[PDB]
Amino acid sequence: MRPLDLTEKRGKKVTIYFEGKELEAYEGEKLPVALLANEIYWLTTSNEGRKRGAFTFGPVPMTVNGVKGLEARRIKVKDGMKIERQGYYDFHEEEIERVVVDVAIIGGGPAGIGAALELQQYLTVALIEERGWLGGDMWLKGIKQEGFNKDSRKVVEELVGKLNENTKIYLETSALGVFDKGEYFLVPVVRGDKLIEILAKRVVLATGAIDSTMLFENNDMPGVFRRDFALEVMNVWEVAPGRKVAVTGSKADEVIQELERWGIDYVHIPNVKRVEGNEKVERVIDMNNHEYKVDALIFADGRRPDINPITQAGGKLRFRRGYYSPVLDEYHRIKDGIYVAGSAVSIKPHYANYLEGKLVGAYILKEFGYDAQPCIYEEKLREYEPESLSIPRIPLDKFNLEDVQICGCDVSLKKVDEVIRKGITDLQIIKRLTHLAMGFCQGRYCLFNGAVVVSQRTGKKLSEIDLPVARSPIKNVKMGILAR
């Protein structure tokens, strides 16, 4: 057992080296998780000298066997592996498959599975998921779940269990976007390092929501965990974020329930001002200047639909219930032939998103001439009012602005605030002046916040501040993979 193991691992034991030090890991574990288990948090430094971990926004470039600039999260641990830290900008110096399919479902959470289950009654589908497992956010929980009155992870197993050979599953697979060729849609997809082109008649974006990022002082430092990452390490791998854990944000109960299940000690800090520490977090300070000693901070401030795949697919947005949503016709369509389902549509219980996927799959099944009954899913859905999110009042005056990070790359809240103060309110321009939303997330974890700041400094309402649209490759792909 390593110090942060929640279980004794029974996988094949393996040995790796971090900065020369000999560490034990298990086969199949991903680099940052093996290092966490061994109490190692600080994995890289940004170009302007900011220490960083793997469990919040931003990329983790690491030298993995003399090969510079590999992404830590993507790398499985391997016996004899030589791992080292490096600069942010340090790079290394040194057979297309075509598959035709009826629908192409992007995203493998409850919505995606839902759609696939409905669809494979008669059609051939691609279920595309970049994640390596086929649950959704649901596979991150293991707490009993409403709707299917049954344990979160047990439901996923049941559902995956029910998939046909009519469903081609694509794990560890990144969709690069959707391209309408009139007669079909092209969804180019990357798995391992092969490019696969999926030509489909229909598409469904079952694309999910992403966790909102909280603005407080060293919010990027090692040992801060965004909700999803904390749940992943605890529930998927079985590793604690730390020995004693601070928890914050408006959905902190979801996290606390997991902590309690695993018996991980914690404090609940409703309003975080700052985190401090040399390599990692060791104190958090609240808005009343109270300090708490802890090894990690976990924040959970609500999920918001990931709008990138929507807007690259050519969909339009609406602001409602504290977040941006897809504008849909009466059939959950973004545009003719592209359906949207799940937490991509709105925030609501897993079961609801599951139904919406079935709903969306049923419409296309009806399109195809099969006798489906989308409305039974429709009427089940209405039983679930979509959730709201409070819009954050960022106490700008009360923060030391250069310490609070807005995006992954450079980009402090101060830089953004500065340009707004000089009159610029158009996010298009803000994007260019500061590098907000130009980093390796494409604004996923910062655009909305940038908007909130403009809105706050301006008085201009959020339902009027329109968002820069997502462009060509919605996910990072390198570049060799795309020739010839």
Ligand X SMILES: Nc1ncnc2c1ncn2[C@@H]1O[C@H](COP(=O)(O)OP(=O)(O)OP(=O)(O)O)[C@@H](O)[C@H]1O
Ligand Y SMILES: Cc1cc2nc3c(=O)[nH]c(=O)nc-3n(C[C@H](O)[C@H](O)C(O)COP(=O)(O)O)c2cc1C
Chain contacts with ligand X (rule: CB under 6 A): 106-112, 128-131, 136-138, 174-175, 206-209, 309, 342-344, 350, 353, 474-475
Residue pair 246/298 in contact by the 8 Å Cβ criterion: yes
Q: Is-contact 374 403, C-beta < 8 A?
A: no
Cβ closest to ligand Y, residue 154 vs residue 471: 471
Per-residue contact string for residues 377-416; x = within reach of its own copies by CB under 8 A: -xx-------------------------------------
Q: What is the DSSP string of 416-427?
A: HHHHHHTT---H
Least Cβ distance, residue 188 to ligand X (angstroms)? 10
Query: What type of residue is 109?
Result: G
With CB under 5 to 8 Å by kind, the binding choice for 407 among ligand Y, ligand X, Fe ion, none is Fe ion
Closest distance of CB 418 from ligand X, Å: 33
Residue 47 binds its own copies (CB under 8 A): no
Which range, of 34-42, 153-161, 312-320, 464-472, touches ligand Y by CB under 6 A? 464-472
- State which H helix or E strand residue 452 sits in: helix 447-458
Least Å from the CB of residue 277 to its own copies: 56
Binder to its own copies among 1, 96, 376, 482 (CB under 8 A)? 376
Strand positions, DSSP E, 253-351: 265-268, 272-276, 283-286, 291-293, 296-299, 303-305, 317-320, 323-326, 333-335, 338-340
Alpha carbon of residue 125 to chain centroid: 24
Determine if 96 is a binding residue for its own copies (CB under 8 A): no
Which one of Fe ion, ligand Y, ligand X, none interacts with residue 469, CB within 5 to 8 A by kind? Answer: ligand Y
Which residues are annotated binding-site positions for ATP? 111, 129, 131, 137, 175, 207, 303, 343, 350, 353
Q: Measured from the CB of residue 440, what is the shortest distance to Fe ion in angstroms?
A: 6
For the record, the structure tokens of 342 come out as: 């799940």
Nearer to Fe ion, 124 or 308 (CB): 308
The span of 256-264, 372-380, 394-402, 451-459 binding its own copies (CB under 8 A) equals 372-380
Shortest separation between residue 328's beta carbon and ligand Y, angstroms? 22
Report the site for ligand Y in 379-438 (rule: CB under 6 A): 438
The residue with tokens 């299940």 is 261
CA-to-CA dists, residue 231 to 76, 299, 315, 319, 324, angstroms: 19, 11, 31, 28, 25
Based on CB atoms, which residue is closest to Fe ion, 258 or 417? 417
Residue 359 or 438: the one with the smaller Cβ distance to ligand Y is: 438
How many CB atoms are closer than 10 A to CB 328? 19
Q: What residues have CB less than 8 Å from 351, skipping those under 6 apart?
A: 110, 145, 146, 147, 148, 384
According to DSSP, residue 267 is labeled E
Question: How far does CA 336 lie from the centroid of its chain?
Answer: 27
Residues forming the annotated binding site for FMN? Answer: 431-432, 438, 442, 471
Distance, CA of 483 to CA of 329 (rounded, Å): 38
Tell whether residue 53 is a contact of ligand Y (CB under 6 A): no
Query: What distance in Å separates the CA atoms of residue 116 and residue 170, rounded to the nearest whole number?
Result: 13
Contact (CB, 8 A) for 139 and 132: no
Binding partner selected for residue 206 from its own copies, ligand Y, ligand X, none, CB under the kind-specific 5 to 8 Å limit? ligand X
Between the alpha carbon of residue 432 and those of residues 306, 428, 435, the distances in Å are 22, 7, 6
For Fe ion, the binding residues (CB under 5 A) are: 407-408, 439, 441
For its own copies, the binding residues (CB under 8 A) are: 373, 375-376, 378-379
For ligand Y, the binding residues (CB under 6 A) are: 438, 468-469, 471
